[PDB]
């Protein structure tokens, strides 16, 4: 792509490892830090994809 390829994603933050031959597809918010965020998708709570 001349500009970018926003088609294939990946996960950077997960709570724990996954067992062999496991598929985990989900669109959620990762509770980074000590603030219990509830979908802010902002500071100290990043999108894992």
Partner 1 sequence: RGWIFGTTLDSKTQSLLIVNNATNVVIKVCEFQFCNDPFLDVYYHENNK
Q: Which residues bind partner 1 (CB under 8 A)?
A: 25-28
Residue 28 CB, shortest distance to partner 1, in Å, is 7
Place of tokens 């100290």: 44
Cβ count within 10 A of residue 6: 7
Q: Least distance to partner 1 from the beta carbon of 25, Å?
A: 8
Would you say 16 or 27 has its CB closer to partner 1? Answer: 27
Q: Which is nearer to partner 1, 29 or 46 (CB)?
A: 29
Q: Do 32 and 46 form a contact (C-beta atoms < 8 A)?
A: yes
C-alpha 28/C-alpha 31 separation (Å) is 10
């Amino acid at each position: 792509k001349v500009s970018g390829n926003y088609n294939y994603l990946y996960r950077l933050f997960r709570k724990s490892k996954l067992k062999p031959f496991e598929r985990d597809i989900s669109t959620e918010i990762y509770q980074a830090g000590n603030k219990p965020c509830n979908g802010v998708a902002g500071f100290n709570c990043y999108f894992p994809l």
